[PDB]
């Protein structure tokens, strides 16, 4: 029979890119360092001090710059069925963003998103106070196709500002971006195609770095990192495990991720509403990405990173505004989703005990209504490579000496990332954890595991000092300690006892009845 007339719409982007100056700054996503002197240099310093981003430079980079091709070449082989893909509202909440970074985000979306797939770009002003975001912004956006600008009536925070955008959205799919992003070519089709296959998939781009000082684009074609967390409940990145890599049919297929970096993701609008959207009790910034990740997995969805979708993000030098609510937000997530495992969190971030977190009754009712699975399920099924501490009563906290009163084990690595190979010492107990937080485990190891990777105390061959190693699957012989009832700390391989010795360090000595060889755990100082 005769071919049917296809669905009408242009596959080309909503807007064409204007002509580029051949010598323009930052044109190919390269690093730019301007080497300024005098007053121009002071203006650059002031822009960094004011935005935590080199806005002096951003103001001199095109708002219409095309990112270089950086993805795996197999992504170019993908064919998409534009006639059947859903349409998306792109939602961009912003608070006091600079002019050039925000507008470059908008033009990037309009200049990379296929017209047939993009319903609208919704900007949500979260009660910004900067003047360039007022009448000047409305005037600049007023004529653009497929752009809406919505303004909050008071400071909402990113959660509730995003929900303002979602509430106004007209597309089938909600795609959230930050107000300082730049889209790789072809970023949108993979997300929409995946949601077209599975309504309950929340799908994230791989988030590439755009450097806040040079605006260099650092996307690459390798396997991306995926999202996890540690037991301080801070988001961390990790490498894709072998379990998940075996299940991928090609390198450019979607990858299941325990958690999301947050803020860049696509989701069916009906499914986002079905899952209870966002906890409206979270404030300002932080913690919502973890709560949303836990909710997605425990309540029956899938959270995935799509290797063919790349979005660059200007990670700032430091926090550009006060982020004092992340702890309370994380407590809301922990109290609703983590069950008994919230205690491992409270042990490693004791401030969380004191933090007011409001009323979570309605989120707990949401969890019951959706019949969600429990947190032990999430750990065993979604994130089994995360080590789960035991924190047995009497076996965690500060490791204090009986003889040398008020001194406890203390380990402070030079770099917080590289913890291996330095001596554990003794130090006046301060009760703040981190460097004085240890856990004695059922596998006889003394673990240093406020954050990951877990460190385990060891004694190298023929030495008397205590050195920080990494914990392994099977405890090596030089990491095994026996903590007896009376307090003796016996190193099995040396056949020696740990003794508080002269500053102060713990050293192996022959076992005696001395109190300087007696140790005990204390959770709190008083």
């Amino acid at each position: 029979g005769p071919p049917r007339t296809p669905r009408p719409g242009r596959r080309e982007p909503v807007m064409p890119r204007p002509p580029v100056p051949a010598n323009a700054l930052g044109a190919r996503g390269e690093a730019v360092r301007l080497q300024l002197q005098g007053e121009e240099l002071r203006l650059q310093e002031e822009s960094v001090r004011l935005h935590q981003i080199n806005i002096y430079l951003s103001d001199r980079i095109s708002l219409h710059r095309r990112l270089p091709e950086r993805w795996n070449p197999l992504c170019k082989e993908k064919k998409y069925d534009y006639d059947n893909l859903p349409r998306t509202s792109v939602i961009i909440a912003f608070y006091n963003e600079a002019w050039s970074t925000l507008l470059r985000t908008v033009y990037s979306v309009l200049e990379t998103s296929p017209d047939i797939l993009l319903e609208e770009v919704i900007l949500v002003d979260d009660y910004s106070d900067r003047e360039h975001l007022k009448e000047r912004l409305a005037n600049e956006l007023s004529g653009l196709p497929k752009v809406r600008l919505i303004r909050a009536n008071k400071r909402e925070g990113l959660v509730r500002a995003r929900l303002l955008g979602a509430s106004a959205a007209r597309g089938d799919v909600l795609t959230f971006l930050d107000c300082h992003c730049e889209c790789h070519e072809g970023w949108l089709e993979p997300l929409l195609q995946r949601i077209h296959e599975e309504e309950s998939a929340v799908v994230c781009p791989v988030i590439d770095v755009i450097d806040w000082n040079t605006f260099e684009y650092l996307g690459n074609s390798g396997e991306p990192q995926i999202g996890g967390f540690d037991w301080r409940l801070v988001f961390t990145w990790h490498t894709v495990p072998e379990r998940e890599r075996i299940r991928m049919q090609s390198p450019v297929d979607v990858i299941r991720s325990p958690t999301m970096a947050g803020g860049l993701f696509a989701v069916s609008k009906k499914y986002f509403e079905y899952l209870g959207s966002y906890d409206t009790g979270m404030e300002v910034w932080g913690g919502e990405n973890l709560e949303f990740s836990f909710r997605i997995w425990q309540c029956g969805g899938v959270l995935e990173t799509h290797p063919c979708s790349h979005v660059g993000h200007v990670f700032p030098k430091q926090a550009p505004y006060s982020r004092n609510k992340a702890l309370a937000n994380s407590v809301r997530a922990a109290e609703v989703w983590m069950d008994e495992f919230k205690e491992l969190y409270y042990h490693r971030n004791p401030r969380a005990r004191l933090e007011p977190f409001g009323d979570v009754t309605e989120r707990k009712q949401l969890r019951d209504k959706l019949q969600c699975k429990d947190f032990k399920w999430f750990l065993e099924t979604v994130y089994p490579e995360l080590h789960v501490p035991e924190d047995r009563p009497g076996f965690f906290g500060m490791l204090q000496n009986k003889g040398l009163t008020d001194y406890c084990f203390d380990y402070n690595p030079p770099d917080e990332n590289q913890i291996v190979g330095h001596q554990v010492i003794l130090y006046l107990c301060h009760g703040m954890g981190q460097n004085q937080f240890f856990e004695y485990t059922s596998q006889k190891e003394i673990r240093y595991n406020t954050h990951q990777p877990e460190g385990c105390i060891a004694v190298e061959a023929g030495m008397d000092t205590l050195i920080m190693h990494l914990c392994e699957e099977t405890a090596p012989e030089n990491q095994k300690f026996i903590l007896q009832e009376d307090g003796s700390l016996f190193h099995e391989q040396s056949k020696k006892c740990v003794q508080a010795a002269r500053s102060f360090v713990p050293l192996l000595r022959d076992c005696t009845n001395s109190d300087h060889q007696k140790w005990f755990f204390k959770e709190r100082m008083l």
């Binding site: 988030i207 991306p224 301080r232 913690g287 990670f315 992340a326 301060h430 981190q434």
Partner: peptide, 13 residues
């Protein structure tokens, strides 16, 4: 002595 930012990924991967 003694969560304010979203980490970037390392140059490694």
């Amino acid at each position: 002595t003694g969560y304010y930012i979203t980490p970037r990924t390392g140059a490694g991967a």
